[PDB]
Design a protein around this ligand. Structure first.
Ligand SMILES: NC(=O)c1ccc[n+]([C@@H]2O[C@H](COP(=O)([O-])OP(=O)(O)OC[C@H]3O[C@@H](n4cnc5c(N)ncnc54)[C@H](OP(=O)(O)O)[C@@H]3O)[C@@H](O)[C@H]2O)c1
Ligand SMILES: NC(=O)c1ccc[n+]([C@@H]2O[C@H](COP(=O)([O-])OP(=O)(O)OC[C@H]3O[C@@H](n4cnc5c(N)ncnc54)[C@H](OP(=O)(O)O)[C@@H]3O)[C@@H](O)[C@H]2O)c1
Lengths: 195, 195
């Protein structure tokens, strides 16, 4: 059994669409692509150069294709994404000229990939696929970065597949720009009481 | 002009409904009332004290009525809510047995109260009213306690009134129970660039 970590950049109101640039994802006429862009300092770069250490990867086709247009040319900066196997969930794509790309089609294939032997799995972007991972409680860990911004519209990290669940805060951090790094571990069922 | 702070307990996916107990709010058949219970600790109380400072208050009718059913009988623990004026939005309730309760009926009234002279306004609970405040950009600070839990269903702090807007993280801490205190100042507009 492999660990599955979801890593995500979200706004205060949990919007995850198009962190990195104005055109990264225009679904809905989304106007705020690049909202992650004013909150990048050098200690943020060092916090997630360690988050970038080599692993295996699980991605939705759309996030795969956003990555495949850029990262094959920048293996200097992020070698992990280029060397590790990238398992990609898709029904419309079966091959890619990006090295070490495998294509899964089913919830069964994800479960086998998890049960199979090998390195821990990182999940970047992939909002729609994350919905399926959440709904089957396959997500073992959450690394989040919460930015001081609210954007009513936009694809969300906790969306359709969010289930009731509990977590442990493994560790946390803050950024000179005011970004909270939050690191949760899956922790069983939601507990209630009275205050 | 007065400083409208909004204070709110939210899950990781931003639900604020019924933090304190199982029957506190049962709209939609909400099964997770009291989800903040297992995360109450000592440090949390200390912060609660600085936020239980004598202020004026602005509340929605439902939150006022939940408060009025318990807090007038515990002026020792949380005085300020009994001593300060409570401005309550309603078109349903005109008077109350609680000392220092004023009843406002329009958006204009909330603005006039803001433009008035007096103590800085705290806002607790009041998701439906918060929506109107957000929509007209009357909220100036945000003190959030983010709890290590997810519950897909429930009333959301950032609901239909949320508007795109930037913030300045003025403070942050983590409790021994894994809750994230994060207070934000309102900071003008959303900036985008390219990473
Ligand atoms: N906040 C961040 O950290 C971050 C980082 C990078 C990107 N992003 C954003 O993530 C978003 C990526 O777009 P997206 O989330 O809408 O799509 P996606 O999850 O990346 O991929 C969607 C595609 O993957 C397949 N897929 C996903 N879920 C499936 C399921 N449950 N069952 C079967 N196939 C499934 C399908 O491929 P087929 O159509 O081929 O069948 C689907 O069309 C963008 O907005 C991107 O900007 C965020
Ligand atoms: N997470 C926390 O920190 C926290 C703390 C305490 C409570 N809560 C939760 O907050 C929720 C409070 O209930 P709620 O948010 O649904 O209602 P609410 O905002 O507390 O009050 C609803 C009533 O206030 C009036 N009102 C609100 N907005 C109005 C508007 N835009 N225009 C005119 N009148 C308006 C109306 O009164 P009339 O109908 O009388 O006209 C409305 O019916 C509960 O779920 C409670 O458990 C959360």
């Amino acid at each position: 059994m492999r660990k599955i970590t979801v890593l995500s950049f979200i706004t205060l109101d949990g919007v995850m669409q198009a962190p990195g640039g104005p055109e990264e994802d225009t679904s809905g006429g989304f106007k705020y692509g690049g909202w992650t862009a004013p909150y990048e300092d050098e200690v943020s770069g060092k916090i997630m150069e360690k988050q970038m250490k080599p692993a295996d990867y699980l991605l939705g086709r759309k996030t795969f294709e956003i990555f495949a247009s850029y990262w094959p040319e920048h293996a200097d900066f992020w070698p992990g994404i280029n060397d590790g196997t990238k398992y990609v969930m898709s029904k419309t794509v079966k091959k890619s000229d990006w090295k070490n790309s495998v294509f899964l089609e089913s919830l069964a294939d994800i479960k086998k990939l998890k049960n199979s032997e090998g390195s821990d799995i990182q999940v970047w972007g992939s909002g729609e696929l994350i919905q399926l991972l959440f709904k089957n409680d396959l997500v073992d860990e959450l690394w989040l970065k919460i930015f001081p911004v609210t954007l009513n519209t936009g694809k969300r990290l906790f969306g359709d597949g969010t289930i009731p669940a509990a977590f442990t805060l493994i560790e946390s951090s803050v950024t000179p720009s005011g970004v909270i790094i939050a690191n949760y571990k899956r922790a069983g069922e939601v507990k209630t009481g009275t205050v």
